[PDB]
Amino acid sequence: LGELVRGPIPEPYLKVRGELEKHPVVTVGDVVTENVLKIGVKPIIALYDLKAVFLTVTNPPGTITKALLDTVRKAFGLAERGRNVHILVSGEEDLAAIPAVLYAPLGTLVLYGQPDEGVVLIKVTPECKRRCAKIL
Numbered sequence: 001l002g003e004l005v006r007g008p009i010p011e012p013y014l015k016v017r018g019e020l021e022k023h024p025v026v027t028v029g030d031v032v033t034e035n036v037l038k039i040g041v042k043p044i045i046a047l048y049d050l051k052a053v054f055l056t057v058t059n060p061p062g063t064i065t066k067a068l069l070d071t072v073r074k075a076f077g078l079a080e081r082g083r084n085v086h087i088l089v090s091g092e093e094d095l096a097a098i099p100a101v102l103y104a105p106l107g108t109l110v111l112y113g114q115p116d117e118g119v120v121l122i123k124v125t126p127e128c129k130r131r132c133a134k135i136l
């Protein structure tokens, strides 16, 4: 929904680093997560596929189960309390950016990967929270 930042890995992470350091960050994807960690930023929540507190969840590709939605809500609960949470998904977390935006505090940056293209960065605001609810 937000802004795509283009470039070969890891140049987009380097471009946005200053912004990532000044806000809480949620990462969706193994490549996104790893790349944010390696520039010294610790996500409050990181969701990635199986191949800090750990939560496990199964989510069949191209769905948003009730279980994923609960795990994400729980994650944000734990993050409110200053835990970093890694959600390890068995299945696929292809849609997980939507709930991330729903349940997130305002001013949170959510990142996910645009295959081959770059990194999508989303500033969490009442508008984009509104539409993400609509998307579901």
Ligand SMILES: Nc1nc2c(ncn2[C@@H]2O[C@H](COP(=O)(O)OP(=O)(O)OP(=O)(O)O)[C@@H](O)[C@H]2O)c(=O)[nH]1
Residues within 6 Å of the ligand: 006, 007, 008, 009, 010, 011, 012, 013, 028, 029, 030, 031, 032, 033, 047, 048, 049, 050, 093, 112, 113, 114, 115, 116, 117, 118, 119
């Ligand atoms: N050009 C470019 N593409 C990127 C960049 N970061 C991520 N992407 C793309 O986004 C894709 C998806 O990222 P992830 O979802 O983290 O990767 P994944 O292997 O699907 O990880 P899982 O979702 O855990 O299975 C990657 O395969 C890349 O092609 C970047 O900095 N530049």
Ligand SMILES: [Mg+2]
Residues within 6 Å of the ligand: 028, 029, 030, 093, 094, 113
């Ligand atoms: Mg992915």
